[PDB]
Design a protein around this ligand. Structure first.
Ligand SMILES: Cc1cc2nc3c(=O)[nH]c(=O)nc-3n(C[C@H](O)[C@H](O)[C@H](O)COP(=O)(O)OP(=O)(O)OC[C@H]3O[C@@H](n4cnc5c(N)ncnc54)[C@H](O)[C@@H]3O)c2cc1C
Length: 257
């Protein structure tokens, strides 16, 4: 240890039996950009047990936040799911990630396409003032299997527009598009299937993807990433990086182990 920050959990909210979010303290020296992740975990037998976790809290927040999965036989989240208020967690002090604005070229629209816990890094981005200065429209797409998996759906819809600080920009510039596959919901199907049929653009009121206006940030399941990456690359969109800005950047919400 000592390469980590000791933070204290301040709030825990369990969305389902597999999804829960918890907030912690934020070290005064901990600094990050919206869309980055860190090594988050526990101190086990004097050794760090950490996994990659996107920072779901705003960089303006005096605190951290993590949108976490709950795996029964998972080394970290089986102990991490039983977190309580006041418990100690360790966060690495070196953020890293590809979900940065500077990895994208200046555009008119930012399409945040996410599934499951891939909403975590975009909860920080939509709660960043800079994304609304750089992009006229921020489209936050969240794909889940059940309605109960739509975490933060009342916060983004009802409480984020009332933010004393980002409210008028979230009201004007943020578009929130949740979709559910396996339960009756007002939006059905995979987010890829909504791109092929064009229902995504009919619902959000924006034209189809073009190389001049639309930038994308992808953070979801490997099967959504590989399917949306083929969709984006075959229309001409290129992947951006630190050395070469592009139209879309991609981060894994998890890996299949
Ligand atoms: C860049 C990056 C960012 C990440 N951001 C997040 C984040 O914001 N929130 C988060 O919960 N995880 C995130 N992860 C995944 C992270 O590794 C998980 O915390 C971890 O895999 C699960 O903890 P574990 O050790 O108990 O389970 P593991 O032993 O690591 O894996 C348990 C099983 O569940 C699967 N799994 C792991 N994470 C998820 C997930 N989020 N959703 C669905 N299935 C999953 C794995 O593929 C595996 O089969 C991220 C991973 C990367 C690489």
């Amino acid at each position: 240890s000592s390469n980590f920050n000791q933070e204290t959990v301040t709030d825990i909210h369990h969305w389902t039996d597999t999804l829960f979010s918890f907030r912690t303290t934020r070290d005064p020296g901990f600094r990050f950009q919206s869309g980055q992740f860190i090594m988050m975990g526990l101190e086990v037998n004097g050794k760090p047990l950490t996994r990659a976790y996107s920072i779901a809290s705003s960089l303006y927040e005096d605190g951290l936040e993590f949108f976490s999965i709950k795996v029964p036989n998972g080394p970290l989240t089986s102990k991490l799911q039983h977190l309580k208020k006041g418990d100690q967690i360790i966060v690495s002090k070196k953020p890293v990630g590809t979900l940065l604005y500077d990895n994208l070229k200046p555009g008119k629209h930012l399409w945040l396409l996410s599934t499951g816990t891939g909403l975590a890094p975009f909860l920080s981005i939509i709660r960043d003032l800079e994304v609304y200065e750089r992009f006229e429209k921020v489209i936050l797409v969240h794909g889940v299997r059940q309605v109960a998996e739509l975490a933060y759906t009342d916060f983004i819809s009802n409480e984020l527009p009332q933010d004393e600080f980002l409210g008028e920009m979230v009201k004007n510039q943020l578009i929130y598009y949740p979709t559910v596959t396996r339960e009756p919901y007002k939006t059905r199907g995979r987010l890829t299937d909504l791109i092929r049929s064009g229902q995504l653009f009919k619902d959000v009121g924006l034209p189809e993807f073009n190389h001049e206006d639309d930038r994308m940030m992808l953070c979801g399941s490997p099967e959504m990433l590989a399917e949306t990456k083929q969709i984006l690359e075959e229309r001409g969109f290129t992947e951006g990086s630190q050395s070469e800005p592009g139209e879309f950047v991609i981060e894994k919400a998890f890996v299949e182990k």
